[PDB]
Copies of this chain bind each other. A is one copy, B any other.
Amino acid sequence: SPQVLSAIIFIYFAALTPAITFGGLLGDKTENMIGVSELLLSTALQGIIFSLLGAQPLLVLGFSGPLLVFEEAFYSFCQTNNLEYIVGRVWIGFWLILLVVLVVAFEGSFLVRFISRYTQEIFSFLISLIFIYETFYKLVTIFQDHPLQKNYDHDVLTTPKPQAALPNTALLSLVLMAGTFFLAMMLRKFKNSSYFPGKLRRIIGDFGVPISILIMVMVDALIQDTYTQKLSVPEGLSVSNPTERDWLIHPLGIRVEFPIWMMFASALPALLVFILIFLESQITTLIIFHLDLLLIIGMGGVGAIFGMPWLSATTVKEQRISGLLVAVLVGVSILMGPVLRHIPLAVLFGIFLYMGVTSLSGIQLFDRVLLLLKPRKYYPEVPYARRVKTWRMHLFTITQIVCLVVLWVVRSIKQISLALPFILILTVPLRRFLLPFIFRDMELKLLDADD
């Protein structure tokens, strides 16, 4: 039906848009080990396997930034010492799979009963902050790679990688990403505005991000004289840098023999990733059960077999057909490599920054955070502040802030990394034990009152 015709394309766009940016980021952090296509196939197969077996087939299994954060932290750690990233990840997957049965024998979803708003809200805020910090660090990267000069060099080879800084790039890319973010904001406000009658406005507002990415691509096409960093997409059904990885992966290593003492030592990261995905799931379960959760964990563990990243839950009978269609369209999307290689990276970074900012805008914790600076004479009437002393809420905000700052510091230090989930998790008992010791039950029933 026409309703299904529009919905399938809308959901396909919504699912494909973040995937492109995620794959671009993965290709950026990795040398070329993981790009878009591998994760694209992973989610392609994920959609169909989940739709066939799923308590809620209407749900979507996309990818979330914290997964990328953990993956890049693992990449950094593997860069600290001579290690095989992919094989290590495969071993982590093995640990996941052997862990799954422990929960299959007896449910372990009890912690679902021990989740709090105060924890997940600040976690999301921290994730947004890290998004912004990475986006900003990219500008430093470009400035250092392309120092501001006036002479430069002539006819520098740049097909695989720019051998020398060239003019028209350290600033034009900034223009591209800034325009992307600006237009995304404009289209968001327009969607939330009074222009055009209802449906006529919201129909295009829902596709703002899908549509506010092609204008910059057209501009880049019109300006073909100056090189820009774009996608290095291989041919169809071909791995990114086949000289470094193939579809078939040797657990003993392809170029280097994986350490034996690291075979059985890969358990520690797996539980972290498991906890991350577990806490991620319940958030998407709120719109309205260990079978679906365990299925997702098993699928994530399997996804590492051939060298693809794991996925995560995302937003929203013919339910199974819907999942089937989006998954098959995702699989088909792999074929546009030639045209997609014209797409520059600054656009992806701008879209990622816009997504992070918009995700931040949905947090009430940030609202109260910014209200702290706001004078105590114009606070909007919210049924959690008018009945509470302002300074008390400031104390709660400062506690959250110091936790966030400690997490940020841990993130900054490279030697001590991959421990962020652990330090974050030990916060929940603090909310369950320390917070009641300081604040009244009625007081606490207004701040972290999850709905």
Contact = CB atoms under 8 A, between A and B. Distances in A.
Given A171-B171, A175-B175, A150 B194 contact: no
A27 interface: no
Interface string A361-377: 00000000000011101
Contacts of A151: 154
Given A149-B225, A150-B167, A378 B175 contact: no
A197 interface: yes
13 contacts: A148-B225, A150-B167, A150-B225, A151-B154, A167-B167, A167-B168, A168-B171, A171-B172, A171-B175, A194-B375, A195-B375, A196-B375, A197-B377
Please classify the interface of chain A as helix (H, G, I), strand (E, B), loop, or mixed, using the class held by over half of its residues: loop
Given A167-B168, A172-B171, A175-B175, A194 B148 contact: no
Interface string A196-240: 110000000000000000000000000101100000000000000
Interface in A157-195: 167-168, 171-172, 174-175, 194-195
**A-B residue pairs, 10 tightest by C-beta:** A150-B225, A194-B378, A167-B167, A150-B226, A197-B375, A148-B225, A148-B223, A171-B175, A167-B168, A150-B168
Interface in A54-73: none
Which of A154, A174, A375 has the largest count of B CB atoms less than 10 A from its CB? A375
Nearest to A166: B150
Given A150-B225, A151-B154, A171-B171, 20 more contacts: A148-B225, A148-B226, A150-B167, A150-B168, A150-B226, A167-B168, A168-B168, A168-B171, A171-B172, A171-B175, A174-B175, A175-B175, A194-B374, A194-B375, A194-B378, A195-B374, A195-B375, A196-B375, A197-B375, A197-B377
